[PDB]
Amino acid sequence: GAMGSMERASLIQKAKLAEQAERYEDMAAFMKGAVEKGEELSCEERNLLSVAYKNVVGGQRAAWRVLSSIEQKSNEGPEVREYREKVETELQGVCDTVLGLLDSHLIKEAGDAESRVFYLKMKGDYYRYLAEVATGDKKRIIDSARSAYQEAMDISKKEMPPTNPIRLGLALNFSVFHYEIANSPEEAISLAKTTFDEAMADLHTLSEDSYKDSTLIMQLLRDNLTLWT
Amino acid sequence: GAMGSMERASLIQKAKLAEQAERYEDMAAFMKGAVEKGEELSCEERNLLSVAYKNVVGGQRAAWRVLSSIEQKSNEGPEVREYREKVETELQGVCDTVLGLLDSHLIKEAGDAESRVFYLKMKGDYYRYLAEVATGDKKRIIDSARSAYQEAMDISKKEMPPTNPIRLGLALNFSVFHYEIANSPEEAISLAKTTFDEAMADLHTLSEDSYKDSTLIMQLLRDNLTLWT
Amino acid sequence: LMFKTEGP
Amino acid sequence: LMFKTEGP
Ligand SMILES: Cc1ccc(-c2cccc3cc(C(=N)N)sc23)nc1N
Ligand SMILES: Cc1ccc(-c2cccc3cc(C(=N)N)sc23)nc1N
Ligand SMILES: Cc1ccc(-c2cccc3cc(C(=N)N)sc23)nc1N
Numbered sequence A, B: 001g002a003m004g005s006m007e008r009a010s011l012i013q014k015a016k017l018a019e020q021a022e023r024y025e026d027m028a029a030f031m032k033g034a035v036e037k038g039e040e041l042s043c044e045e046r047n048l049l050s051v052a053y054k055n056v057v058g059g060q061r062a063a064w065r066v067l068s069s070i071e072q073k074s075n076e077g078p079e080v081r082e083y084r085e086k087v088e089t090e091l092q093g094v095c096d097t098v099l100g101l102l103d104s105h106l107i108k109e110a111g112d113a114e115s116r117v118f119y120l121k122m123k124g125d126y127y128r129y130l131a132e133v134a135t136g137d138k139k140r141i142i143d144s145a146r147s148a149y150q151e152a153m154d155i156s157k158k159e160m161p162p163t164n165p166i167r168l169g170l171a172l173n174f175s176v177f178h179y180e181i182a183n184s185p186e187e188a189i190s191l192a193k194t195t196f197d198e199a200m201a202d203l204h205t206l207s208e209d210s211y212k213d214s215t216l217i218m219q220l221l222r223d224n225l226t227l228w229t
Numbered sequence C, D: 001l002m003f004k005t006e007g008p
């Protein structure tokens, strides 16, 4: 814990500043520090944690795909493979760090549905990112993602309205998992359709501000369905 | 030298891959490794070195300006100042690293005008970035930038055509130095005008490909003149 | 090409 | 606002 000497509140404040400065590696290190204070995270703090690591790992995933593509082109010197391995290793270390925060001890202390579903979604996401680069224990990684996503689905279906943005973002990502990772395009399509339709039928209950949040994610479901069908 | 065990050619190849992956911190570390092999750099290699560090320091400059602005707003907790100082320190370390490569020993071994002007321009640029964040020995930093830029100008005026893209990019940056750093807007305007006009009168000598390179930088001179007048 | 997932 | 300088 490099951040062990900084106040929890200062870490959160600095995470917000780093976001404004587009310094996402800093943002993630600050939020890791906050998590390691051992207190549960608020809604805003969970989202800061997620945004920070999503941005960090997103940069690594984009680099890995560029390099993997080049590696494949030259296969149809060791340098492309070596550098792809370097980036791959850094990505895996980021995913392992996020999964370690969730395991020690965010998930076990999350009793409310909004926190527990949020963290289980994250666990599915970061196993999915590991699965994207995996070859050998790819099967066990895939099943770890599936299991986390499914537990999050089961809770969100019992505890959250169908328009809840966390539930919608969960279903969106689990759908992509099904399509791209588990080679289950029909499951992906069914999940996205059923999610969209049940959300549609619940929008009448929402305030204008909730409506905006939910319909934004529904559009992402529709966007994928359009590509998939 | 973390990169001391990698071949010079592999470092260059990996710098090019990192550029494709938009991994500019990696790109700079690879090019620093290549410089530290002690051989002179080719034209392409100099540009790889410059692009890499320009991207790294550009991200730090943008963050510093965001944070400096926030710091000022709250002045008209210590966290904004502390984090601005952190970023500022990281920026200064990058500038110091680049200046150390130029001093040990790129500049002293650069005998051709195209290499010597390129490196002296860089030295001016990285002193300018230090000047942007300086307060106290700001005067000595400013004069170090001025001196490097001026030596580059003197050589380029004796040894390069007025359309040479290195000469044009030098004059562009020295103009901005004059305007923003040295508080000499009239010098900045005169330099940009005289540079543009002498380049204009030399374009007739260029191939279609050289013409494209030169006129691109002339447009940047014109863009600034439009803001400045 | 990447399909839409949640967040940035 | 920043004035144009050379490169990226
Ligand atoms: C009190 C509160 C504040 C913000 C949020 C929130 C919700 C969804 C996304 C998101 C992204 C954020 C960011 N990029 N900083 S904050 C945030 N939720 C709350 N309950
Ligand atoms: C769906 C959603 C997205 C963002 C936010 C949000 C709320 C409060 C502050 C804040 C700061 C942000 C930033 N600095 N990028 S996003 C954000 N809330 C939501 N319900
Ligand atoms: C042989 C050769 C190749 C490339 C260049 C070159 C020139 C100006 C800008 C620039 C940027 C580059 C990059 N972003 N990789 S290469 C490059 N010059 C040469 N003499």
Ligand SMILES: Cc1ccc(-c2cccc3cc(C(=N)N)sc23)nc1N
Pocket: B019, B020, B213
């Ligand atoms: C003015 C100028 C800009 C770029 C280049 C250039 C040349 C050869 C290769 C290459 C690769 C680049 C990249 N991968 N971004 S730029 C570039 N040459 C020039 N004369």
Ligand SMILES: [Cl-]
Pocket: A082, A083, A086, B014
């Ligand atoms: Cl490597």
Ligand SMILES: [Cl-]
Pocket: A014, B082, B083, B086
């Ligand atoms: Cl700090």
Ligand SMILES: [Mg+2]
Pocket: A007, A008
């Ligand atoms: Mg405390």
Ligand SMILES: [Mg+2]
Pocket: A085, A088, A089
């Ligand atoms: Mg590997």
Ligand SMILES: [Mg+2]
Pocket: A186
């Ligand atoms: Mg079918």
Ligand SMILES: [Mg+2]
Pocket: B007, B008
């Ligand atoms: Mg060798």
Ligand SMILES: [Mg+2]
Pocket: B085, B088, B089
């Ligand atoms: Mg300082």
Ligand SMILES: [Mg+2]
Pocket: B186
């Ligand atoms: Mg006047």
